[PDB]
Amino acid sequence: DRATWKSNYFLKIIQLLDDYPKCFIVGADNVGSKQMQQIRMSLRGKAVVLMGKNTMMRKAIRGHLENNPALEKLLPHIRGNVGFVFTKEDLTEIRDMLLANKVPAAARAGAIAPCEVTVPAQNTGLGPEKTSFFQALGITTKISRGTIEILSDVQLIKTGDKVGASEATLLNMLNISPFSFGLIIQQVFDNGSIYN
């Protein structure tokens, strides 16, 4: 149950700080479970990435602090959906591989827009029967080669818009999603030191 789940999460955060004295305190903001599972399955032999409740991790640090007096600089940097990644291989190779394991995820109907979605003017490969999903956007189209010809471009959503339902299914039809959310790491903890 929940009590033994709390109590053995305590032990599996005692041990993973005892054996790894080098960490990135990583902000896992709005990434998918799919993407985090495929990154975690890719990076198993190199590192261990871990998540949890911030008010449980900080009390685990305040259960260590009479034994390991170096861990308390983590405490002001644990807020937001922010976990840990532990590694012993090198210092910036895993920074670079976290920057290289980024995947552009789909645009959910209700997510806010980080950056700049447009569509190129092109003949798609969809077909004639799927033009009502363009007519809801009111994009002027033509049909040629049996598929739909986009005449001119449209910047459909700005930097900082709400992604609507009619505007979300059409990008999933065109298999284009510029929204790339990955690990956006904040600080570094290496043996009582802080790097940006």
Partner 1 sequence: EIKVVYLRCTGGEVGATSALAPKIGPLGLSPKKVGDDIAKATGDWKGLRITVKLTIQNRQAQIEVVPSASALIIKALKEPPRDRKKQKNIKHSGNITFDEIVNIARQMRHRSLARELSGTIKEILGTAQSVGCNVDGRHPHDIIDDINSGAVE
Partner 2 sequence: IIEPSLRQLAQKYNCDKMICRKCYARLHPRAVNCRKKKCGHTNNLRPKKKVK
Partner RNA sequence: CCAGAAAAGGUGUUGGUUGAUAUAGACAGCAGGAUGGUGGCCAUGGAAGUCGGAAUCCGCUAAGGAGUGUGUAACAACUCAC
For binding to partner 1 (CB under 8 A), which residues are involved? Answer: 41, 44, 125, 127, 146-147
Give which of partner 1, partner 2, RNA, none residue 53 binds (C-beta under 5 to 8 Å, depending on kind).
RNA
DSSP string, 131-167: -HHHHTTT--EEEETTEEEE-S-EEEE-TT-BPPSHH
Q: For residue 3, give the H/E element and its range.
A: helix 2-18
Contact positions vs RNA (CB under 7 A)? 2, 5-7, 9-10, 28-34, 36-37, 40-41, 44, 48-53, 55-56, 59, 81, 83, 106, 108-112, 165, 168-169, 172
**Binds 147, which of partner 2, partner 1, RNA, none (CB < 5 to 8 A, cut-off by type)?**
partner 1
* AA letter at 172: N
Q: What are phi and psi of 174, to 5 degrees?
A: -80, -5
Contact 126, 147 (CB under 8 A): yes
Q: Please state the closest distance from residue 176 (CB atom) to RNA, in A.
A: 15
Enumerate the H helices of 49-165 as residue ranges.
54-64, 93-100, 132-135
CB of 147 to partner 1, least distance (A): 8
Taking the complex as a whole, the smallest distance from the CB of residue 170 to partner 2 amounts, in Å, to 14
- Which two tokens mark 151? 């005449």
Q: Among partner 1, partner 2, RNA, none, what binds residue 193 when CB lies within 5 to 8 Å by partner kind?
A: none
Contacts of 62 (CB under 8 A, 6+ apart): 75
- Report the residue from 123, 131, 141, 166 that binds partner 2 according to the rule CB under 8 A: 166
Residues that bind partner 2 (CB under 8 A): 136, 164, 166
